[PDB]
Design a protein around this ligand. Structure first.
Ligand SMILES: *[B]([O])([O])[C]([C]N1[C]=C(C([O])=O)N=N1)[N]C(=O)[C]SC1=NN=C([N])S1
Length: 355
């Protein structure tokens, strides 16, 4: 059916249900990008949420970190066999130097939790944290979703490219993807487009930023048109120059499975058609918060789909795409809503515009 009708039926009611100030929903189908905006970027200013509004992607940032890692790997700047001390020399001869880069990128070091400790903020505190790290579970065998893990991966990628991570994205990866308003650090010239998001009590929220390396885990900001372009790049990598094409495709390869979920670089991958329950289970407390023993991949699914949720204190994100149907969807909000609502609403929309 018409995309607007399906988005109105499935996404629009979430604004009233969760008191969300503004939502941007994009659908790409047959290489045509459709944008739908509801509500306000700023409640106080009566400023409509729009195609220039900048949203925090939360953990969808990890898809850009993955793309940077795929870009570096396919240019020979890193091997996924390498360990972090080859690039971050102060980690040589430490226990974390037994973990390879793929294991860090896919959360299988065996002893890294969701967040850095609160007291770890400066670059020295991060280095000391990794120098003091010791193994717990067998390396490679257990997935524990982890911002420090992919943060160390991103730091190594940046070192291998002789640029800080913010510049890896802003000077290399974002331009190669054709993104015009995606940032690690939003400049003052974009201030009118980047308002605080809203906490659960509808108050504009900010916190002090955490360690710089965690920007690779949750620190990217973008707009709906740029996210639609990023989905287009994931659906149609042959339209892009060869180096970024290789980087995008690197992020699609499953590295191991946990139940019905395959862990790719950044992306979560599923056999397609996937049931709603499979997609919901990927965001369950068991998978997101607890360690789970991985299963090596023997047969990667021949027909696949991919998704990722992201959240920050003030913002919600969901992205999903299905190569066989040549369709994808992006949802951005300036207030968190439950992941299950994001996944269900996207499932209802994409299931009806299949072709
Ligand atoms: B990511 O979005 O997966 C990641 C972990 N996570 C999941 C959820 C959820 O399900 O609501 N919340 N966190 N996101 C982060 O670690 C965000 S950390 C920050 N949030 N706000 C900041 N200013 S930093």
């Amino acid at each position: 059916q018409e995309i607007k009708k399906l988005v109105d039926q499935n996404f629009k009611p979430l604004l009233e249900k969760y008191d969300v100030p503004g939502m941007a929903v994009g659908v790409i189908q047959n290489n045509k990008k459709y944008e739908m905006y509801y509500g306000l970027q700023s409640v106080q200013d009566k400023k409509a949420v729009n195609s220039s509004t900048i949203f925090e992607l939360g953990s969808v940032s990890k898809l850009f970190t993955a793309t940077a890692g795929g870009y570096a790997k396919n240019k020979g700047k890193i091997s996924f066999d390498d360990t972090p001390g080859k690039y971050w020399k102060e980690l040589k001869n430490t226990p974390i130097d037994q973990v390879n880069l793929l294991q860090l990128a896919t959360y299988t070091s065996g002893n890294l939790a969701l967040q850095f400790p609160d007291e770890v903020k400066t670059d020295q505190q991060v280095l000391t944290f990794f120098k003091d790290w010791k193994p717990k579970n067998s390396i490679g065998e257990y997935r524990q979703y982890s911002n420090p893990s992919i943060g160390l991966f991103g730091k190594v990628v940046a070192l291998s490219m002789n640029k800080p991570f913010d510049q890896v994205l802003e000077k290399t990866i974002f331009p190669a993807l054709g993104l015009k308003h995606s940032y690690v650090n939003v400049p003052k010239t974009q201030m009118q487009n980047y308002d605080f998001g809203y906490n659960q009590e509808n108050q504009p929220i900010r916190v002090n930023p955490g360690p710089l390396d965690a920007l690779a885990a949750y620190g990217v900001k973008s707009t709906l048109p740029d996210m639609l372009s990023f989905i287009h790049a994931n659906l149609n990598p042959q339209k892009y120059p060869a180096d970024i094409q290789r980087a995008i495709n690197e992020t699609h390869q499953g590295r191991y499975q946990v139940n019905t979920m395959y862990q790719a670089l950044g992306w979560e991958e599923f056999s397609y058609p996937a049931t709603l329950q499979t997609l919901l289970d990927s965001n369950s407390e068991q998978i997101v918060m607890k360690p789970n023993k991985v299963t090596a991949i023997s047969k990667e699914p021949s027909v696949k789909m991919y998704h990722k949720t992201g959240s920050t204190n003030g913002f919600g994100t969901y992205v999903v795409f299905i190569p066989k149907e040549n369709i994808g969807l992006v949802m951005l909000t300036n207030k968190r809503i439950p992941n299950e609502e994001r996944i269900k609403a996207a499932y209802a929309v994409l299931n009806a515009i299949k072709k």
